[PDB]
Paper text:
Deoxynivalenol (DON) is a toxicologically relevant trichothecene mycotoxin frequently found in cereal products.
TaGST-10 was cocrystallized with its reaction product, DON-13-GSH, to observe substrate/product binding at the active site. TaGST-10 crystallized as a dimer in the asymmetric unit and contained a molecule of DON-13-GSH in each active site. Similar to S-hexyl-GSH in TaGSTU4, the GSH moiety of DON-13-GSH is mainly bound by polar interactions involving hydrogen bonds between Glu70 and Ser71 with the glutamyl residue, Val58 with the cysteinyl residue, and Lys44 with the glycine residue of GSH. The catalytic serine of TaGST-10 forms a hydrogen bond with the cysteinyl-sulfur of DON-13-GSH. The only polar interaction with DON is a hydrogen bond between the hydroxy group of Ser116 with the C15 oxygen of DON. DON-13-cysteine is located at the entrance of a cavity located between the two domains of chain A. This cavity is formed by residues on α1, β2, and the loop connecting α8 and α9.
Author numbering:
A (entry chain B): 7 to 118, 127 to 221
B (entry chain A): 7 to 120, 127 to 224
């Protein structure tokens, strides 16, 4: 398609890029990376970090899921809806919660063991507040349609579901964070999301 | 037209915001926060993280230095030069190197500052950033070209904190012998009037570092 994703099926960072491409309806070639013996194309395309996702558009590689999400938004502006808000302030809000998901939630969630689990439920509690304040009674961070923040968090949903099914816990417990519980179901049930969301059972085996 | 910056004189993250405002020529109110006893305005403006910088433009706060730089770029468009490249690819390169400075260089120099292992990672990251400069600059003085751009400000924000460390240690982080492009860059960016106007006294930074 002249759009190539260097991927790994179990990565939430790769799932972010798949979700962004799917929501717009941009076609792409998926290439599965073996991260134990990395491809020539991966090592040439991301020489500094050697991680997936990499998006290659028209010979030019793009690295880091949040950078890729923004790239997609700028380069495919005329194809399907935008993830980023139109106005500077709304964009600043979206990038803030993007930074928080990666800098706070993922630092804690990857670390989660007891002490890490204290930080995870604190970060989830904050994200319940983010959703109430961003959404304004609408289903998503982006409003009536899924936006940047929804994709950054939505990318981690299968990872979160697998973790939950292993432990016997709900990260998005309806008793504690009802808005996030409903959001996981609403985002999860989008046709564009269901088309790329990996089987949870398969994730569990991998981990 | 009200720009208030909730700052701390020793923060490289704050100095990023000052650099961007200075390079554009946007006026702002600098407010020095005490991070030991945080103000009511800081606690209300950044309720989730309680960190400086916060930029308040017409009553609306913005948090996280890299987010703030991009906001200024979007909100003050055609006041002075833009920090971000025009084309999506060049912006993706600029955002990549921004993420690398925060995620790799700063993570390593904090681990160095709290020793050999961290010194391996700092040297490694500076080496990589020599390559970023060669590839980004295209024979011009800066990452953003003939004028400073986003990457120059993200790295430029750490120059005071680098120079104090270097002053106390007797070492160059941007050593001419090992990263000559970065050494020339540090001198070029540091000699800009817009940079010089907000660059803290090294001697006061030395003392502050020495306390920690
Ligand atoms: C929350 C969470 C989920 C897990 O998902 C995958 C797996 O289940 C374990 C794993 C380590 C973690 C464990 O915790 C995780 O944070 C994560 O890291 C995982 O491999 C990560 S994905 C492969 C990885 N890529 C990135 O890190 C990209 C990050 C980049 N900032 C982006 O945004 O583009 C890579 O390529 N590593 C190099 C190599 O493996 O050789
Ligand atoms: C390289 C480096 C320099 C030092 O600079 C300042 C000081 O010299 C010591 C200090 C801790 C370090 C020590 O090593 C440093 O990494 C950093 O950590 C320092 O206080 C940091 S600035 C104040 C801090 N802000 C942020 O962290 C914002 C980051 C955010 N991602 C952004 O981008 O907005 C805050 O507001 N903290 C709240 C509280 O103090 O309660
Ligand atoms: C007296 C002060 C002046 C003022 O100058 C610059 C700017 O306008 C805001 C700033 C933070 C201050 C705020 O009050 C200050 O103390 C200083 O901290 C500043 O970036 C300092 S850089 C330059 C100078 N070498 C220094 O270190 O003083
Ligand atoms: Na952070
Ligand atoms: Na909010
Ligand atoms: Na909408
Ligand atoms: Na300039
Ligand atoms: Na606020
Ligand atoms: Na960035
Ligand atoms: Na990084
Ligand atoms: Na300039």
């Amino acid at each position: 398609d002249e759009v190539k994703l260097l991927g790994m099926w179990a990565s939430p960072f790769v799932l972010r890029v798949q979700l962004a491409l799917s929501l717009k309806g941009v076609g792409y070639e998926y290439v599965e990376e073996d991260l134990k013996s990395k491809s020539e194309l991966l090592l040439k395309s991301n020489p500094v970090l050697q991680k997936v996702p990499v998006l290659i558009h028209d010979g030019k590689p793009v690295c880091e899921s949040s950078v890729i999400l923004q790239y997609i938004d700028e380069a495919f502006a005329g194809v399907g809806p935008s993830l980023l808000p139109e106005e500077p302030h709304g964009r600043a809000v979206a990038r803030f919660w993007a930074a928080y998901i990666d800098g706070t939630l993922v630092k804690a969630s990857s670390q989660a063991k007891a002490e890490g689990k204290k930080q995870v439920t604190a970060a989830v509690e904050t994200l319940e507040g983010a959703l109430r304040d961003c959404s304004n009674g609408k289903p998503f961070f982006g409003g009536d349609t899924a936006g940047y923040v929804d994709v950054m968090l939505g990318g981690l949903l299968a990872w979160v579901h697998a973790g939950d099914k292993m432990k016997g816990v709900k990260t998005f417990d309806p008793a504690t964070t009802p808005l996030l519980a409903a959001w996981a179901d609403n985002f999860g049930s989008l046709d564009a999301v269901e088309a790329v969301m990996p089987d949870v059972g398969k994730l569990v085996e991998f981990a």
